[PDB]
Amino acid sequence: GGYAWEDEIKRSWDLVKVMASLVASIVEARKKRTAKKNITPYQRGIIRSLILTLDCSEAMLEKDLRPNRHAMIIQYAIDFVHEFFDQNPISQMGIIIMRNGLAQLVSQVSGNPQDHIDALKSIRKQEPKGNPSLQNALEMARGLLLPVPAHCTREVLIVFGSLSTTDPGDIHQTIDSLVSEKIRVKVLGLSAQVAICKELCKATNYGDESFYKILLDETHLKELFNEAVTPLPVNKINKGFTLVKMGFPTRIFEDTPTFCSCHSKLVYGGYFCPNCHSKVCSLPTVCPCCDLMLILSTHLARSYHHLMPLKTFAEVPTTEKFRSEDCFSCQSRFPILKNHKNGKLLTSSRYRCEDCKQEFCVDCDVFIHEILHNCPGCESKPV
Amino acid sequence: ATLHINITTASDEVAQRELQERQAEEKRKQNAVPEWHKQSTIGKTALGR
């Protein structure tokens, strides 16, 4: 009975109370790899047309993301554009921002990533203000994704930072129109689960509720943006399996500069189009003279790895006889990892491929499944 | 007591933001550290008349 601070010393020094120690670290990675066990080659739409919608409201001035939401979302959008056109070269992209209740187009739908980089850098200087509008952004996204062909999957990505939206009309009609035009919308919210974004993601993705993503921290935003560059799997009901007529241009080498057909400027190099013999500056792109796509073989090969993803490497049991004491790809010394003599041999770091029965370490388990896309044991096997 | 209104024909908003950033920059200038505080003055000549 009395005041709080006159009761007793808080005794903060005494609250802290104090070999198989690696097992607790191993089981966390095992639970992480458990979610990635099931994998099969889903059909994915390679040719993409993405409309990136960025929120630029007063709600983007919140200090909970160092330094402010607007600048760091723009920086990760620059990184997203670079990764998206690195891994999906033959795709197209437009950038729309939400500002003052208005949808503002900052880059037309084009395959050149440097234009989008310049547009995002131009946005980064200005300050965000206003009250965002999902319906205006979705209507301009619908307008931008009207002229793209039927073989190209139409996708809209929204980085929606606010919690409330103000619309000039009924947003359910806009959702119905987006569903009727086969436009898929994935929304990366910043604060909480808004109802209209969840309903939009559920309706435009054929009932899948997993396309509304809410982050946790700084690294989870990188995780979400890195997940977003992979093409979305298409549904079985879609029958737009369409041939695309394109040409493979030839890189010309001339010591005299010439007028390009796309920008009408002096360029020393260029790619002669195989159909109309006109030259283009960048690749891959539609030809300005004949409306024919010009890509390289590496532009197909970059997205070819989504077609047949490699099956995940399974960690071998410790009781099994080891095929090799060294890695197949790098001959890393596989650690015996003997915690103690009574602890015996536990959590051997050998990872086996199913198709070739070869053992790899955790380094090659990381590299063969993210950067490389072919198991060296599978191509070393004389099939 | 008196009531005064300002009518802007959607063109002078950038002017008011220019004013706002101008009091912002003069406030940051008047709250800035002096040159002798952020930089050491021992490398230059001594003070005098």
Partner: protein
């Protein structure tokens, strides 16, 4: 020693080669280093479990220094007394000290801890109807106290009131220290009070930590709490008065501080004015209730001169009434000549010492432990400054070179004339004028302190700014103060030593210290606390300005280096400024001509029967 051969590099360590202590293998989580030479403790603030050792060391030890990275503490007997008084046994402290330190604790340190902690709480001081008694739980301890027999006619005996400090000192010399704790929960002779804090008032958590250090065991323990000026040192005394709920008296250094403390008791705590009385020259009424508040200055109670009959009656009432608690604001004047008796003529169980300057030039400051008690709480000034509680002062020192004739005259005269000679250097005039011109354009409110009154008058004549000294009219002083506070064309006020003391001054952000009363560490913090309560503390990027103008190659350097010792021990960094950008293109040049400098120099040298009544 632990059988370790000295090294070749170890020959230059004067008995401080402590490499015989074997490093523990799990030392990455242990943030303490123990030196067996004097019990000095080294703490790191970046390792894991840093705060668990930090709060423990600030409870069991005093801080030598607290910089940002590595803190340095001292183990002393009094901090151990404060730690064991709040319920910390020896074995737990020793065990967690071995746990939290990389090096093992030596035998000498453990023996010192055991010797200091034991025989504590044996002798205790009690007051029974304004009569001091010493009591011991063991009978023989009264018999070993057989040297200083000042006994005047469970195991308790009476001590004369005027010689109680000698008893405290002689018990400190022996290993049986004195203990003073007010058990106000079990005290029923003194009438209780219904004093409480207002629900609309908030208490900032470091004040709660200081009160918890004062009231760790649930009883009022006498001691000294030091806080920065303007950071709420009065609120701690207000909360302590609301806590003990007994008869509380407050002693201040000035009558303006007395009326400020009466304002404190009227506004931040629920005290009706009939419980509050003022004992000053103008105000002498005394409360008719059985228990209340009286606020006064040390000067009346400690006066050895002939006092008036009303003041004699008030003093006799203060002597005859048993007080339960006393607030000693600005405790640094307590160890002086007559103020040392203010705890002897007034009988109080709990003694609180509140100040901002716990430093004096003489050693008698170290006698406060014999007057008030153990040092309770030391405030971390960086922690308060980085949280916006006090302004971030930029301690700078502007160096002023000498002219040849002035410094030649400086080398040929005595020190008293030398002081006025190095204050009146024209280089300091130019530097002060440039600083005023620079800080007036920024909208900063400037207070310029200089103790020499002739220097103050010369500065006021040369620059054209108002000046305040001791013998100035008081209405003129208030007029200058509101002209500083409200009128914007006066932003620089020149003050003498009057502004150094605890008087009401308007808020300012810029201070220029021209001269000072020799090397006084108290005056630096007294002046710096004026700008610690600045209004712009909530503004981001605001930095208060504190410049100390010194005359180069003279005794200003020595005096300022001695003066800045307390401020750098608190943590402030005094950055040197030997060049100011603006001397070459200054509009107004003060004493630029050599003849004007010479004229100033000889001015300083010349300074030192009802009918016959109409006939006259």
């Amino acid at each position: 020693p632990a059988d370790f051969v000295p090294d070749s590099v170890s020959g230059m360590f004067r008995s401080h080669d402590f490499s015989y202590l074997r490093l523990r293998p799990d030392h990455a989580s242990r943030p303490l280093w123990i030196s067996p030479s004097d019990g000095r403790i080294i703490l790191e603030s970046f390792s894991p479990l840093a705060e668990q050792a930090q709060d423990f060391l600030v409870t069991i030890a005093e801080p030598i220094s607290r910089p940002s990275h590595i803190h340095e503490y001292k183990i002393t007997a009094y901090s151990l007394y404060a730690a064991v008084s709040v319920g910390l046994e020896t074995d737990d402290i020793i065990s967690v000290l071995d746990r939290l330190s990389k090096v093992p604790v030596a035998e000498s340190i453990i023996n010192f801890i055991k010797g200091a902690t034991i025989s504590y709480g044996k002798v205790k001081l009690v007051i029974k109807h304004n009569r001091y008694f010493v009591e011991t739980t063991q009978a023989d301890i009264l018999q070993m106290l057989l040297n200083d027999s000042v006994i005047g006619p469970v195991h308790s005996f009476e001590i004369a009131n005027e010689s109680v400090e000698v008893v405290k000192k002689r018990c400190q010399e022996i290993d049986y220290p004195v203990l003073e704790e007010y058990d106000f929960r079990n005290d029923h002779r003194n009438p209780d009070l219904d004093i409480d804090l207002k629900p609309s008032t908030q208490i900032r958590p470091y004040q709660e930590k200081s009160l918890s250090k004062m009231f760790g065991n649930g009883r009022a323990r006498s001691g000294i709490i030091v806080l920065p000026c303007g950071a709420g040192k009065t609120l701690v005394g207000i909360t302590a008065a609301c806590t003990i709920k007994k008869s509380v008296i407050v002693l201040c250094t000035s009558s303006v501080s007395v009326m400020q403390w009466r304002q404190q008791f009227l506004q931040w705590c629920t005290l009706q004015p009939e419980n509050c009385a003022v004992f000053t020259s103008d105000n002498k009424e005394m409360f008719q209730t059985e228990s209340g508040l009286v606020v006064s200055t040390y000067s009346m109670v400690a006066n050895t001169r002939n006092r008036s009959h009303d003041s004699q009656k008030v003093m006799d009432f203060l002597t005859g009434r048993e007080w339960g608690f006393i607030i000693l604001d600005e405790v640094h004047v307590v160890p002086a000549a007559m103020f040392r008796r203010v705890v002897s003529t007034i009988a109080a169980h709990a003694k609180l010492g509140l100040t901002a300057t716990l430093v004096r030039e003489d050693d008698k400051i170290g006698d406060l432990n014999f007057l008030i008690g153990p040092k309770l709480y030391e405030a971390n000034w960086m922690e308060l400054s980085q949280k916006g509680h006090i302004a971030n002062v930029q301690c700078a020192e502007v160096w002023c070179p000498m002219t040849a004739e002035f410094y030649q005259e400086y080398l040929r005269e005595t020190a008293r004339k030398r002081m006025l000679l190095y204050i009146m250097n024209p280089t300091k005039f130019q530097a002060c004028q440039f600083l005023i011109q620079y800080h007036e354009r920024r909208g900063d409110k400037i207070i310029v302190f200089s103790d020499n009154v002739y220097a103050l008058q010369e500065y006021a004549l040369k620059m054209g700014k108002p000046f305040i000294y001791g013998s100035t009219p008081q209405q003129e002083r208030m007029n200058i103060l509101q002209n500083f506070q409200y009128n914007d064309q006066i932003n620089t006020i020149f003050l003498s030593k009057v502004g150094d003391t605890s008087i009401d001054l308007p808020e300012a952000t810029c201070l220029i210290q021209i001269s000072s009363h020799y090397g006084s560490r108290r005056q630096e913090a007294q002046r710096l606390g004026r700008i610690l309560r600045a209004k712009r503390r909530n503004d981001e990027g605001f930095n208060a300005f504190f410049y100390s103008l010194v005359s180069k190659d003279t005794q200003e350097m020595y005096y300022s280096t001695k003066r800045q010792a307390f401020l750098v021990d608190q943590g402030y960094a005094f950055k040197v400024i030997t060049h100011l950008h603006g001397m070459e293109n200054i509009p107004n040049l003060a004493y630029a001509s050599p003849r004007e400098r010479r004229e100033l120099l000889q001015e300083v040298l010349l300074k030192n029967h009802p009918l016959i009544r109409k006939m006259y």
